[model samples]
Target: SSWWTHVEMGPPDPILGVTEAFKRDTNSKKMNLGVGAYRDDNGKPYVLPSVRKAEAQIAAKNLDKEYLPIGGLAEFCKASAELALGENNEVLKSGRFVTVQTISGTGALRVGASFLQRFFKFSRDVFLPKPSWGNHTPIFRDAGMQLQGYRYYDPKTCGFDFSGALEDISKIPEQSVLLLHACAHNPTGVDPRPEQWKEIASVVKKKNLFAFFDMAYQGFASGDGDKDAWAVRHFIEQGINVCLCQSYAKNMGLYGERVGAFTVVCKDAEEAKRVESQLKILIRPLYSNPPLNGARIAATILTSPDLRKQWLQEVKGMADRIISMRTQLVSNLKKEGSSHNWQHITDQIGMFCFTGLKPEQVERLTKEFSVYMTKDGRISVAGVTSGNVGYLAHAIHQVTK
Candidate 1:
């Protein structure tokens, strides 16, 4: 027998696997709402005008393809941090934070998890919200950290279980690490309101829990960068030191470019310096260094005043399109004379909507109507457009009815 014979067969990924199946279906009018990538109203992949401009500028400069530092581009890191935290925030001025360019949001999470595993004095156990992104568990598990779940989504009301979440946060061990989606929660789009976040922050501070924020969609969430970042900023304002993972994929339409950053808030400049040195050490062995092309593109847009404003407008346009699709979907469902309350379709925010369809119902949606989404019934709102919303609503009504 071969040495590799003991390897067991692995199941396909729940998210990507849907895409694979979707590609195999040759139906003429089929719709794919599985992948979370943004699509224009024509059901085509979107390329932001700002990104095109940045690329053209980079080409004009005739820059060399030299290797970047192990921590990646310095200018990119600074700009990314400023985007997440406000430009005028005291943290940026005080030099009490360390930021490093990462491969993408996934890499940022991995690096943060590894750093905490190595240097954190508290327990290795980390609490994640129930029904979080599929990759979160594996990422933390591979990083040598224990995983636990806290209540988050409420199926009955199709909203956030605020009280349950608070109780779980209070019960976790003191000084434990907690993973929070900074904005636009994945799979389920439910998020806490501003007041609820304040109360949650109070519990976290009282319990001395370390907050690790994953912010994948900043401006793409509410069409406003500062608005989407309210939770993270509020936590920092409450004197809660946090570890943040940021991604430019959704906001900048740089999905394949793999641009992101990981940051740690320190007590002072001295501690920030120490953290940066340790981060370099941890990153050197992983990839030795991150790519330079994406960082250059991101830095070019962020550092320039005109390009930054244009990019912000483009991000808001994408968000507005998704929001309009949500409104259309709900209206179409009601127009079809469905008895169910479809308000949740519009209630949830961001690029995804958790349609409460069962597994069998989802199967019918695919087999009977050529409508494809994940088995969990989470549809990428980006995929729904003016041309397809009515059809999608009818399919859903037929299945759920």
Candidate 2:
């Protein structure tokens, strides 16, 4: 009681709590749409075939357990950066960008946020989408930056609020940082079209705001890595210097391994080196260095041409399943005679589907039907399979109707 008396009991996590609740439930038919992880049609966690092959390859090498440098694996960082930013991008050729491996996307966000908080001479405010990833607010807030939200989701249409977003961006003070989802927006599956992204890019340039891209679902969004990265690449082509946070969790099925990278575009080689030096100083005390196993595995997959090709196909396979699930869910709901329009379910892309269910309806889904999802009505489409699509859709219709 001496040391912890002042600390009050904290509330359960908005996302992880669902998983905890799911585990405690006794219903054998229960469904968990809370976590963002991908699941096979049999409701089993999926491990990519490419990942398995990579793991076996690494085990064959039997590499030493020596500690990686403070900046983590150089080859991994280079490969990750090249993958996200494009292999032949001018930024890499000019040596005007720096990248370092981090403890997946969350760690990359924290490192980038911390660097901005400490070194950024511009405003301390960062703008986030109104309905962003649940972890985003806390990640930047804990890093000691002021948080603001811009309009992104329009509940009336259950779609992107492109006009409102542009207006909001225009109103933010010049040089403020804006966090952008590179692809596969979380919580809400909706994403701006390429044309809309162009308009938004124009506003960002006109307003002189900095772009911070969080790319967690590159190949998992559209089943094409280059297609999913269109927005980030567009911004760069428009002469915008950006900070990018990348994760192999969703795309590479390396969630537990925590493989990721944080990248920043600078003016030139000299500036890039200076930024890297400062980044090392910031990262040394925080975990000292990242794990080696994940980085090594990722490098093996990325550097080997055949392995890389296989991994790309596997990524597309996962995305295709999620896409198929969306179609099935919508079809089942319609078949159940849901008068409510669920076109949004199909319109939205990526792992999540904002079902437009109120909190009370969601509660009934959990308590009465044993179906679990976030209170915001965001369902992980990956959780739906051919085995349970009809049941889930019927349950949703009962609560919603």
Candidate 3:
């Protein structure tokens, strides 16, 4: 009785709970833009043709269901590292980096957080954007770190807050930690310009800050890998020794496989070896090994010249659809004769857009129009499709008005 009486009920996850609430809505016009996964213009979960081909290739081999190393599949780690840092980047050429397979993007963040918790023991602070992805706080906090925020998105103008971001960052204690989205910022979908990244790198250098880059979108963001990865590589080029997390969920449509990577850029091969040992040690107790199916599929696509080309085109096709949906949503809103400045809908990129709808308006959208999104007004633009974009736009227009 004593043990059972004090067990409190667990609170539901805000993001996951939205989908649950959405499922019960029987309205014909119900639109759930609360999911993070990509949906095609047909409003169905898409399986990349490249990924399908890779699966078939693996099935033909009839591979053993064996365990992988504590760090993960060698080929997957190698491919993930090259993809994030660029194929011919100096880091790869010089053997100055350590890469490990993680459970997924979330697992990478968790492992990185645990490493920071162990290594950055003297200080326990990691600052993220003020309005970062909702899960970021728990990931770091659970890993024994304090979570703070530097200004990032500006709600007033629905754009990047360059001055505030810089000002906030400039004052962070020297050697403090900073986490950045490599590209396609979540929840807000606002990325700093390439030139702005140079300034950021300079400030980071001046303050001797540690860079932790999260790249969950990669080729899914801009329909190009190198461009989406420019920021992460730039920081490394500037001698920042960046720690990066990569996800294949969006790019390769490997969401269920939970495939991703974590890497640390080191100064020399000697340093890289030492870091690798520690990462392996830290990962040993947590799961011991990562699943191999997703790794093999990702490796197959990445290593094959023809399949890699096909994967790129498929990723680009998905990005184009999302981009088109953004335009269609805006166009439909305008067609509804709405007087709002919906330009930000298109300005933001990747999977999400921070529509500047108030909480009351969002509530009205759900209650009256059956359009469901986060209370923060963030919508997974992938959820908008040719079939529902008009209804969604009309709902937003009516609720906002």
Off by over 4 Å in 1: none
lDDT of 3 at 23: 92
CA lDDT, candidate 1, residue 157: 80
Question: What's the true lDDT of residue 399 in model 1?
Answer: 84
State, as a TM-score between 0 and 1, how close model 2 is to the true structure.
Answer: 0.97
Q: Stretches of candidate 2 above 4 Å error?
A: 15-17
Note the Cα lDDT for every prediction shown.
Answer: 0.92, 0.91, 0.91
Candidate 3 total steric clashes: 0
Instruction: Give the alpha carbon lDDT tens digit for every residue of 1-401 in model 3.
Output: 47699789999788788898899999888988997799887778989998999999999999899889999999889988988887898999999999999999999999999999998855688989978978899999999999889999999988899999999999999888999998999989888999999999999999999999989999999899989999888888888999999999889999999999999999999999998899999999989899899999999999999999999999999889888999999999899999989888888889999999988998999899888899999999988889999899888888876
Candidate number achieving the greatest TM-score relative to the actual structure:
1
**TM-scores for every predicted model:** 0.98, 0.97, 0.97
Q: Candidates sorted by TM-score, descending order?
A: 1, 3, 2
Q: Per-residue CA lDDT of candidate 1, range 125-199, in tens?
A: 999998898889999999999999999998888889999999999999999999999888998999999999999
Give the per-residue lDDT of model 2 (tens digit) for 1-401.
49988999989778788888889999977999986788888888888888889999999988899989988999999999889888899889898999999999999999999999989889899899988987889998998998999999989888999899988998999999999998888889999999999998988899999999999999999799999998998999899999999999989888999999999999899999999999999999889999998899899999999999999998999899999888888999889988988888888989988888889999999999999998888899988888988899899899988
Cα lDDT for residue 6, candidate 2: 92
